[PDB]
Amino acid sequence: IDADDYTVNLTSHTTLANIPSGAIIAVSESLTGKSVTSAGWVKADPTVFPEVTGDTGEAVIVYKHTGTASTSTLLSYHDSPTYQFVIPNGSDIRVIWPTDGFIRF
């Protein structure tokens, strides 16, 4: 996700249809190793976006893929104080999750 094309609002947005459709530098392939713990943490294996070209990108968003963009519910937004951006250049991009889980329920 490109953060100049998407000022995040954790309250008003609900579905993929709310994300300004040009902010999407790349689309996640489906998650794997999806697992849970008694603390309510979700975990998954790292995700690759292959051969990405586009503008500078600054955030990752997770949502329930359901084919129709109007019913695909958003479930998180992520950035970091130090992993602030990526410059796509034809390389792969790898999102490596924190090993102990990345969303709390």
């Binding site: 690759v48 992520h78 970091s80 992993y83 991009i93 999102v95 924190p98 102990d100 990345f102």
Partner: protein, 32 residues
Amino acid sequence: LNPESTGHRDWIFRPDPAEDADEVRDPTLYLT
């Protein structure tokens, strides 16, 4: 010495984890 080393390298992006406070409110009992 190593042809494959002269290709692109993957960007590693590392998100901070998402959590929020356990916000909750208590019901009040009444005698009747």
